[PDB]
Amino acid sequence: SGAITAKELYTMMTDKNISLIIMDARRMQDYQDSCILHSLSVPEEAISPGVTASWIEAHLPDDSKDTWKKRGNVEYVVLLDWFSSAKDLQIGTTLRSLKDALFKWESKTVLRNEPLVLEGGYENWLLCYPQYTTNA
Amino acid sequence: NEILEWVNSLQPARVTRWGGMISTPDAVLQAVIKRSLVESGCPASIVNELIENAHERSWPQGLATLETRQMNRRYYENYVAKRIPGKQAVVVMACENQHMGDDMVQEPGLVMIFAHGVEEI
């Protein structure tokens, strides 16, 4: 488990029946260039191994904190970077660090479900569903 | 005095992304900001207090929490703010901001750091 395909994520996003937060763990500038509609930037720069959810939170701008604090309200938290899938969450990896902060380490907020990794990441999403992306 | 002169040496600032505020900057960021204040010639009498007031733990009631900041955002446009040289940060000095209440600014002033969107007038 711990995974979601682009197809399954698209279906979730188009059927506004299930609550979702998409967390983009790519670099700040990469996010700004192009990101999934309504996704949260939790930038690579604000993430390192062993950090807690609240350590991440402290590094976020006000608008991003609002979404971060509400992470326990939603059914699913989806994680992505450029290229990774759920197989690629080794120690030291940005998505592994983010996931552990969200689901393993000490946090005031418990997620309803295990975070899911977008298979193929943003590279695969851009090519599959560019209309659900910030630049046209 | 030395304070007014320093304030007048600084360029007027425009905050275009209030949602980009960094309310809990880490020590590394605070040291970098402090450095820029010192290098701009911030008087020793106020520099330490301004940097203390760069974090929400020392901000007045009208700025103290995320919830309050989201609610009060529209009022923040009225701040008279100066650019911290070379940074995405502003100083809001009490001497320029008497029109804002004591729950919006305290002496000698405060510092707000942003992710982006700080411009000159």
CATH fold annotation of chain A = Oxidized Rhodanese, domain 1
- Give me the Rg of chain A, rounded: 14 Å
Q: Give the quaternary arrangement of the chains.
A: heterodimer
Say how many strands of chain B there are: 6
Lateral strand order in the biggest sheet of chain A? 1-5-4-2-3
Biggest pleated-sheet summary of chain A: 5 strands, parallel
The number of domains of chain B is 1
- Structural class of chain A comes to alpha/beta
Strand content of chain A: 5-15%
Number of domains of chain A: 1
Biggest β-sheet description of chain B: 4 strands, antiparallel
The amount of helix of chain B comes to: 25-40%
Instruction: Figure out the total of helices of chain A.
Output: 6
The most extensive interface, with participating residues per chain, is:
A-B, 9 and 13 residues
Q: Within the largest sheet of chain B, what's the order of strands?
A: 2-5-4-3
Query: What is the 3D shape of chain A?
Result: globular
Using the 3D structure, state the CATH architecture of chain A.
3-Layer(aba) Sandwich
Question: Could you say which structural class the secondary elements and strand pairing of chain B correspond to?
Answer: alpha+beta
Instruction: Please report the number of helical segments of chain B.
Output: 4
Strand and helix order of chain A: EHEHEHHEHEH
Subcellular location (chain A): Cytoplasm; Nucleus; Endosome membrane; Cell membrane
Protein name (chain A): Ubiquitin carboxyl-terminal hydrolase 8
Domain Rhodanese (chain A): 16-134
Organism (chain A): Homo sapiens (Human)
Features:
heterodimer; A: Oxidized Rhodanese, domain 1; five-stranded parallel sheet; 5 strands; 12% strand; globular; B: two-stranded antiparallel sheet; 4 helices; hydrolase/ligase; E3 ligase
Structure description:
Chain A: Belongs to the peptidase C19 family. Chain A: It is found in: Cytoplasm; Nucleus; Endosome membrane; Cell membrane. Chain A: This is Ubiquitin carboxyl-terminal hydrolase 8. Chain A: Residues 16-134 form the Rhodanese domain. The complex is a heterodimer of chains A (136) and B (121). Chain A has 136 residues and is of the alpha/beta class. Chain A has six helices and five strands, in the order βαβαβααβαβα. Chain A has a single domain, classed as Oxidized Rhodanese, domain 1, CATH 3.40.250.10. Chain A has helices at residues 6-14, 28-33, 53-58, 62-69, 94-103, 121-128; strands at 3-4, 20-24, 40-41, 76-80, 116-118. Chain A has a five-stranded parallel beta sheet with strand order 1-5-4-2-3. In chain A, α5 links the parallel β4 (76-80) and β5 (116-118). The radius of gyration of chain A is 14 Å and the shape is globular. The N and C termini of chain A lie far apart (33 Å). Chain B is of the alpha+beta class and 121 residues long. In chain B, 34% of the residues lie in helices and 17% in strands. Chain B has four helices and six strands; from the N terminus they run αββαααββββ. A four-stranded antiparallel beta sheet of chain B has the order 2-5-4-3, with helices on one face. In chain B, strands 1-6 form a two-stranded antiparallel ribbon. Classes of the chains: A alpha/beta (136), B alpha+beta (121).
